[PDB]
């Protein structure tokens, strides 16, 4: 890594944005239709087109220089090598090992981790098969009809996202996900269910995660109240490494599935944490999900910078955020089954890159992670695209769509879906001028004064950037490949930012203060010494609760 | 409205923010604990506390001057009076009339709308009661067990949000919501259902909404394929005013429920669009939902500026966006049942205020609507609060929480939920200095070298603003009151921005281009000279579809 060169290149990119980057995208496309080919890449059926971004050959040359000066490639090699690149926590970062079916070995501290990874998946598969087949029954001999995952953050969003995304691959048992400490979540989830046919999965590495374990004890009582204490072992599984604590809870060791310190929560869906996903779609589908991620990993590791999809995606995201000054990015998947992808991507991106200090503990040099937000298309069009088109800020779009849906009789609806996806990016680029707006109103034969009055309200600046990702069909493999692409774009951006993508020290202060405030809120102690707002809110809660 | 006074006051606010607004919030609270009282207001049980925002008495006086200069009060009166304040469409704006049980008359174009409003509600209630009781059966004589709403935008987000929010008040029948043109949505929703016990509600004022009516024809074929053509009339209701088209489709007169041009989509959950919510919770609960909104309407209309909750919420929202420069705001409801509130507020806020021209068609003077986003607490803490605490940008928080949950046996979970809510706002304000981070590490007896290595990563800037809203319990009335609060804050901000909150010209370009693109995507027509990216994406789709 070359700090001087990196800084010089950042400055060149800012000068370039100011003086040389394309301003009129209609004109750029008109004069230079070759830009589609130059600013797109494929990996197998996956097409990544960033040609509607405000870039030219000089932009891409500078971005390559940036990737080189940031040592994206060397930092990547360190990750794959099992080096302790999570420096603040002194840990390896090896979510890639979780889906690695090609390497002979991957070493962490002198130990080949691959056999352990594969052994856990094998045990998960045997368990999932048994639950799915009815071979493994509840305490009164019933086939399990419902599974309830209990976890927070990374122990939840991945499982939810993937399970919903793979609905066509999921039959019985039904899958439910509890995460909020709010009692509404566990209460509303368990109330319609029968304990006799329900499996609870408790996802916590330590088995002391306060919110998860509080929910877990509520579920434990729900089982034991109806089926008796002895039934707990037939109605629970644990995703945990705290073998002492899982035994104390009454979960047999053959229903406990572990993972490792080098699996970050927001990168854990590939591990034992994905157990509810594997129960939902079956082990074969879960392994296809792993295989798709693995294909993206091999590509990420091996493709030269100019052909490397995640590197280009990270470079373009960095461009948008740090150089163009866009504070957010909207990720709009044109697939209702990806309804919970944006929320997943919020954790992956924002918790990784929402950082103000570098690896070495110094203040960062520019903006770091942007706000990530979105909803599926077409839904989002009818909620907030008004602002994306006519708002005062430019917000870059990341579009995702499949060439084929899963409904053989509704391909016409899929055609409308695709047309809308392509039309929105086209609209953001081309806009509509006052003359064009005027002409449309004149064609309705409105009075001249009304045309003149309304026309300015129908103007669209255009030149708003977007990129589009197209895959053949959202199947397990394609989903895995998509998530991995985003894991690696986030890695890339973090390296350019100079931050640790793999720690999360920013959650500690809230936890600390929540621990102090619990007995205060519960009426067990005073809010003496705290700020007057915290005091006033505590006082109000107490008054309203009395 | 005084444009020169308004510009002057904005300039004063910018100068005040730079030079005089509080920079050290710990000091601001410790020196002046009275700030909690001065920067909070109540309406009945509803507490609104903005004392953790970066404001003092001079900020608040300037914001009052701003409201006066913008003629917030005159514009509000014009809304309540039925004037055509949606000037670009030449329409009144009277969502407030939909819940108005106190006024003698509300006039639009000389006609009292209140009796029509109340008559539609009465008809909806009779229908809802019949469906709920089993008096109104399917074509083969079954009690309806499932309702499926089909709509886009404002015909979907409100129904979804409110039905989830009021889960404790919803028994039978089950409620489902279809919106995406993606065939996955209607197929996944209808697949498990029995047409014999299913009622489809088609929400489209025109009954020509392309996505909704495509979905509606798919649902109609689903009913007719199993039950026969004649059965359609017993399995559909319409929220529409297109009486000829509704009759042609097969929907009887007594199951069509209308609304008016002065009800905007994103303000429509109070109208006949709320029918599925009314079938879910019952008419008595729906009327309580309206009553809560009405209580907030009367307050908004009648309270003086500095005692007016929506006015002060809009002024603080404007301050954050236009003065402090915060491009987004995070709305974090500490209630799992409000899981779809942020998505609802995105449409309400962003589609209203994501505008670049003033009422008179001139370019706006500064930033308009911000990006609105969020997830419920505590879930969001474990997803993205890392970034909210330690990211490079400050993003203001709007917290919402209840003093009491619906599960007495889980009130300890509710105490944890409230403690986390208060801890997050406290943490955002207070932060943690380097010496404070070091002291925590030193208390764990870590080596000095480790203390110095780690401490900078555990620093929190603090001084990050938030406001908190507390209500006693999320019941129908409280939900109604909360949504109305946000309708009116959006109103208030729009008046300061000088824009039309009530049009949405920005959705037209995308629709236009999607209509054109459909036959090109389908292959029904050849190419016709679009940009190389659109062409490239089309060619890829054709290639992958065979
Ligand atoms: Ca399925
Ligand atoms: Ca203190
Ligand atoms: Ca800003
Ligand atoms: Cl996590
Ligand atoms: Cl004109
Ligand atoms: Cl009609």
Contacts of B191 (CB under 8 A, 6+ apart): none
Q: Rounded to a whole number, what is the largest CA-CA distance in chain B?
A: 82
Residues with CB under 5 A from ligand 3 (ion): B 325, 327
H or E stretch at A94: none
Closest of A153, A139, A120 to residue A200, by C-alpha: A139
CATH code of the region B508-546: 1.10.1390.10
Residues in chain A: 546
Q: What whole-number distance in Å separates Cα of residue A98 and Cα of residue A260?
A: 10
| CA B347 to mean position of chain CA atoms | 6
Q: What whole-number distance in Å separates Cα of residue B126 and Cα of residue B143?
A: 16
Residues in chain B: 546
Q: Least CA distance to A210: which residue of chain B?
A: B416
Which ligand has the nearest atom to the CA of B382? 4
Q: Where are the alpha helices (DSSP H) in A134-167?
A: 157-165
Closest of A36, A99, A43 to residue A300, by C-alpha: A43
Pull the structure tokens for residue B130. Answer: 């019949």
Closest of B153, B389, B525, B277 to residue A380, by C-alpha: B153
Q: Which residue has the tokens 């109208």?
A: B271
Q: Least CA distance to B542: which residue of chain A?
A: A403
Which ligand has the nearest atom to the CA of A285? 1
Asked if the bond preceding A378 is cis, omega within 30° of 0, the reply is yes
CB A159 within 8 A of CB A271: no
CB A532 within 8 A of CB B29: yes
Fold matches, A1-94+288-507 and A95-287: yes
Pull the structure tokens for residue B482. Answer: 């909360």
Q: Give, in order, the Cα–Cα distances in Å from B130 to each of B27, B136, B159, B283.
A: 61, 5, 20, 11
Domain ranges for chain A:
1-94+288-507, 95-287, 508-546
Q: Which residue(s) pair with A333 in the sheet? A: A400
Q: What whole-number distance in Å separates Cα of residue A459 and Cα of residue A453?
A: 12
Asked if the bond preceding B30 is cis, omega within 30° of 0, the reply is no
CB B259 within 8 A of CB B241: yes
H or E stretch at A88: none
Q: Which residue(s) pair with B469 in the sheet? A: B48, B400
Cβ neighbours, 10 Å, residue B282: 20
Q: What whole-number distance in Å separates Cα of residue B75 and Cα of residue B64?
A: 15
The CATH homologous superfamily for domain B1-94+288-507 is Glucose-6-phosphate isomerase like protein; domain 1 (3.40.50.10490)
Q: Least CA distance to A337: which residue of chain B?
A: B184
Q: Give, in order, the Cα–Cα distances in Å from A201 to each of A151, A156, A212, A273.
A: 9, 11, 11, 10
Contacts of A470 (CB under 8 A, 6+ apart): A46, A47, A49, A400, A401, A402, A403, B537, B540, B541, B544
Phi, psi of B39, deg, nearest 5 = -110, 40
Pull the structure tokens for residue B528. Answer: 């016709």
Q: What would the DSSP string read from start to end of B25-67?
A: HHHHHHH-TTHHHHTEEEETTEEEE-TTSS--HHHHHHHHHHH
Q: Do B540 and A410 touch (CB under 8 A)?
A: no
Method: X-ray
Q: What whole-number distance in Å separates Cα of residue B143 and Cα of residue B138?
A: 7
Tally the C-alpha atoms within 13 A of residue B397's C-alpha that lie toward its C-beta.
36
Interface size, chain A vs chain B, as Cβ–Cβ contacts under 8 Å: 486
Contacts of A217 (CB under 8 A, 6+ apart): none
CB B277 within 8 A of CB B269: yes
CB A200 within 8 A of CB A148: yes
Strand, helix or coil for residue B504: coil
Q: What is the resolution of this structure in A?
A: 1.9
Q: What whole-number distance in Å separates Cα of residue A111 and Cα of residue B37?
A: 60
Q: Least CA distance to B467: which residue of chain A?
A: A533
Closest of B463, B344, B443 to residue B26, by C-alpha: B463
Q: What whole-number distance in Å separates Cα of residue A404 and Cα of residue A418?
A: 9
Q: Do A426 and B366 touch (CB under 8 A)?
A: no
Q: Which of B15, B119, B382, B542 is catalytic?
A: B382
Closest of A298, A271, A296, A263 to residue A480, by C-alpha: A296
Q: To probe the interface with B, which of A36, A54, A172, A184 has the most B CB atoms within 10 Å?
A: A184
Query: Which one-letter DSSP state was computed for residue A34?
Result: T
Q: Do A389 and B509 touch (CB under 8 A)?
A: yes
**CA torsion angle for A489, A495, A497, A503 (degrees, to 10)?**
90
Q: What whole-number distance in Å separates Cα of residue A535 and Cα of residue A529?
A: 9
Residues of A in contact with B190 (CB under 8 A): none
Sheet with A397-402: list strands edge to edge: A40-43, A46-49, A466-471, A397-402, A328-334, A371-373
Pull the structure tokens for residue B34. Answer: 């009275």
Closest of B330, B264, B354 to residue B468, by C-alpha: B330
Q: What whole-number distance in Å separates Cα of residue B272 and Cα of residue B277?
A: 10
Phi-psi region at B17: left, alpha or beta (left = phi > 0; alpha = psi -120 to 50)? alpha
Pull the structure tokens for residue B24. Answer: 């050290």
Q: What whole-number distance in Å separates Cα of residue A219 and Cα of residue B383?
A: 23
Checking DSSP bridges between strand B111-112 and strand B146-150, what pairing results, if any?
Answer: unpaired
Q: To probe the interface with A, which of B89, B338, B457 has the most A CB atoms within 10 Å?
A: B457
E-strand ranges in B250-339 read 256-257, 328-334
| CA B262 to mean position of chain CA atoms | 18
Query: Which one-letter DSSP state was computed for residue A196?
Result: G
Q: What would the DSSP string read from start to end of A218-252?
A: HHHHHHHHHH-GGGGGGSEEEE-S-HHHHHHHT--
| CA A83 to mean position of chain CA atoms | 24
Residues of A in contact with B453 (CB under 8 A): 88, 361
Q: What whole-number distance in Å separates Cα of residue A272 and Cα of residue A124?
A: 7
Q: Rounded to a whole number, what is the largest CA-CA distance in chain A?
A: 82
Cβ neighbours, 10 Å, residue B524: 9
Q: Do A505 and B432 touch (CB under 8 A)?
A: no
* Cα B394 to ligand 3 centroid, rounded to whole Å: 9
Pull the structure tokens for residue B169. Answer: 């008040």
Contacts of A46 (CB under 8 A, 6+ apart): A309, A469, A470, A471, A478, A481, A485
Asked if the bond preceding A159 is cis, omega within 30° of 0, the reply is no
Strand, helix or coil for residue B246: helix
Residues of A in contact with B383 (CB under 8 A): 153, 157, 343, 346-347, 350-351
Residues with CB under 5 A from ligand 6 (ion): B 242, 244-245
Q: What whole-number distance in Å separates Cα of residue A529 and Cα of residue A520?
A: 12
Q: Which of B211, B351, B375, B487 is catalytic?
A: B351
In angstroms, the first-to-last Cα distance of chain B is 61
Residues of B in contact with A327 (CB under 8 A): 327-328, 371, 393
CB A125 within 8 A of CB A283: yes
* Cα B505 to ligand 5 centroid, rounded to whole Å: 17
CB A378 within 8 A of CB B182: yes
Pull the structure tokens for residue B437. Answer: 């981070």
Q: Give, in order, the Cα–Cα distances in Å from A234 to each of A189, A198, A254, A313, B345.
A: 19, 9, 11, 46, 43
Q: What whole-number distance in Å separates Cα of residue A288 and Cα of residue A267?
A: 17
Q: What whole-number distance in Å separates Cα of residue B151 and Cα of residue B159?
A: 10
Q: What whole-number distance in Å separates Cα of residue A508 and Cα of residue A293?
A: 31
Q: What would the DSSP string read from start to end of B210-242?
A: HHHHHHHHHHHHHHHHHH-GGGGGGSEEEE-S-
Secondary-structure percent of chain B, ordered helix, strand, coil, rounded to 5:
55, 10, 30
Q: Where are the alpha helices (DSSP H) in A282-321?
A: 283-302, 309-318
H or E stretch at B468: strand B466-471
Q: Give, in order, the Cα–Cα distances in Å from B203 to each of A400, B92, B177, B268, B309.
A: 28, 21, 11, 11, 33
Q: Least CA distance to B432: which residue of chain A?
A: A509
Q: What whole-number distance in Å separates Cα of residue B22 and Cα of residue A26?
A: 46
Q: Between B167, B509, B536, which is nearest A49 by CB?
A: B536
Q: What whole-number distance in Å separates Cα of residue B201 and Cα of residue B240?
A: 10
Cβ neighbours, 10 Å, residue A472: 17
Q: What whole-number distance in Å separates Cα of residue A336 and Cα of residue A405?
A: 11
Q: What whole-number distance in Å separates Cα of residue B332 and Cα of residue B387?
A: 14
H or E stretch at A261: none
* Cα A461 to ligand 2 centroid, rounded to whole Å: 50
Q: What whole-number distance in Å separates Cα of residue A367 and Cα of residue A381?
A: 28
**Is A351 noted as a catalytic residue in this protein?**
yes
Q: What whole-number distance in Å separates Cα of residue A155 and Cα of residue A149?
A: 9
Query: Which one-letter DSSP state was computed for residue B98?
Result: G
Q: What whole-number distance in Å separates Cα of residue B47 and Cα of residue B399?
A: 11
Q: Do A387 and B362 touch (CB under 8 A)?
A: no
Pull the structure tokens for residue B220. Answer: 């109609």
Q: Which of B118, B221, B511, B542 is catalytic?
A: B511
* Cα A455 to ligand 5 centroid, rounded to whole Å: 7
Q: What whole-number distance in Å separates Cα of residue A373 and Cα of residue A361?
A: 28
Q: Which residue has the tokens 């039959």?
A: A171
Pull the structure tokens for residue B261. Answer: 């041009």
CB B460 within 8 A of CB A506: yes
Checking DSSP bridges between strand A256-257 and strand A236-239, what pairing results, if any?
Answer: parallel
In angstroms, the first-to-last Cα distance of chain A is 61
Angle at A142 between CA A136 and CA A146, to 5 degrees: 80
**Is A306 noted as a catalytic residue in this protein?**
no
The CATH homologous superfamily for domain A95-287 is Glucose-6-phosphate isomerase like protein; domain 1 (3.40.50.10490)
* Cα A167 to ligand 4 centroid, rounded to whole Å: 24
| CA A150 to mean position of chain CA atoms | 19
Closest of A413, A414, A419, A430 to residue A466, by C-alpha: A430
Closest of A58, A77, A75 to residue A492, by C-alpha: A75
Q: Is B512 exposed, middle or buried (0-12, 13-18, 19+ CB in 10 A)?
A: middle
Q: Do A186 and B410 touch (CB under 8 A)?
A: yes
Q: To probe the interface with A, which of B209, B382, B446, B459 has the most A CB atoms within 10 Å?
A: B382
Pull the structure tokens for residue A14. Answer: 């800012």
CB A198 within 8 A of CB A138: yes
Q: Which residue has the tokens 């009277």?
A: B94
Contacts of A72 (CB under 8 A, 6+ apart): A305, A311, A314, A492, A495, A496
Q: Which of A15, A221, A307, A511 is catalytic?
A: A511
Q: Which residue has the tokens 């037939």?
A: A234
Q: Which residue has the tokens 């019985």?
A: A172
Cα distance from B250 to chain A (closest Cα, Å)?
22
**Is A205 noted as a catalytic residue in this protein?**
no
């Amino acid at each position: 890594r070359d700090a001087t060169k990196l800084e010089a290149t950042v400055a060149k990119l800012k000068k370039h944005w100011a003086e040389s980057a394309p301003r009129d995208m209609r004109a750029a496309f008109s004069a230079d239709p070759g830009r589609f080919g130059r600013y797109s890449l494929c990996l197998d059926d996956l097409l990544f087109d960033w040609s509607k971004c405000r870039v030219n050959d000089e932009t891409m040359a500078l971005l390559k220089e940036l990737a080189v000066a940031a040592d994206v490639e060397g930092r990547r090699a360190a990750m794959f090598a099992g080096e302790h690149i999570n420096n603040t926590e002194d840990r390896a970062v090896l979510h890639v090992a979780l889906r690695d079916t090609s390497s002979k070995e991957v070493l962490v501290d002198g130990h080949n981790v691959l056999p352990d990874v594969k052994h856990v998946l094998d045990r998960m598969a045997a368990f999932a098969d048994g639950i799915r087949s009815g071979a493994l029954k509840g305490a009164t001999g019933r086939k399990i009809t419902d599974i309830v995952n209990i976890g927070i953050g990374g122990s939840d969003l991945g499982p939810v996202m993937a399970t919903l995304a793979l609905a066509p691959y999921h039959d019985e048992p039904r899958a439910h996900f509890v995460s909020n400490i709010d009692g509404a979540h566990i209460a509303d989830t368990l109330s319609p269910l029968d304990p006799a046919s329900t499996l609870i999965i408790v996802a916590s590495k330590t088995f002391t995660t306060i919110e998860t374990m509080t929910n877990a004890q509520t579920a434990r009582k729900w089982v034991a109240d109806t089926l008796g204490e002895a039934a707990v072992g037939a109605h629970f599984a644990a995703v945990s490494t705290a073998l002492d604590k899982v035994a104390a809870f009454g979960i047999p060791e053959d229903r406990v599935f572990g993972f490792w310190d080098w699996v970050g929560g927001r990168y854990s869906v590939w591990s034992a944490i994905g157990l509810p996903v594997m129960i939902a779609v079956g082990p074969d589908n879960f392994r296809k999900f792993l295989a798709g991620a693995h294909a993206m990993d091999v590509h990420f590791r091996d493709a030269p910078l100019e052909k490397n999809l995640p590197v280009m995606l990270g470079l373009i995201g960095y461009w948008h955020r740090a150089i163009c000054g866009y504070g957010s990015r909207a990720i709009i998947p044109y697939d209702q089954r990806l309804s919970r992808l944006p929320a997943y991507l919020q954790q992956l991106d924002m918790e990784s890159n929402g950082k103000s200090v570098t690896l070495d503990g110094k203040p960062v040099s520019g903006p770091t992670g942007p706000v990530v937000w979105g909803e599926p298309g077409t839904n989002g069009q009818h909620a907030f695209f008004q602002l994306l088109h006519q708002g005062t800020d430019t917000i870059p779009l990341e579009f995702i769509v499949a060439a084929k849906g899963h409904e053989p009789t509704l391909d016409h609806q899929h055609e409308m879906l695709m047309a809308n996806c392509l039309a929105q990016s086209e609209a953001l680029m081309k806009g509509r001028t006052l003359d064009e707006a005027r002409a449309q109103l004149q064609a309705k034969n409105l009075p001249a004064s009304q045309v003149e009055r309304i026309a300015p309200h129908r103007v669209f600046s255009g030149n708003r950037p977007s990129l589009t990702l197209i895959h053949d069909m959202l199947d397990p493999y394609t989903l895995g490949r998509l998530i991995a692409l985003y894991e690696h774009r986030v890695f890339v951006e973090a390296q350019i930012f100079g931050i640790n993508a793999f720690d999360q020290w920013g959650v500690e202060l809230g936890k600390e203060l929540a621990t102090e405030l619990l007995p205060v809120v519960s009426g067990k102690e005073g809010a003496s010494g705290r700020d007057a707002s915290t005091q006033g809110l505590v006082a109000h809660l107490h008054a309203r609760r009395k």
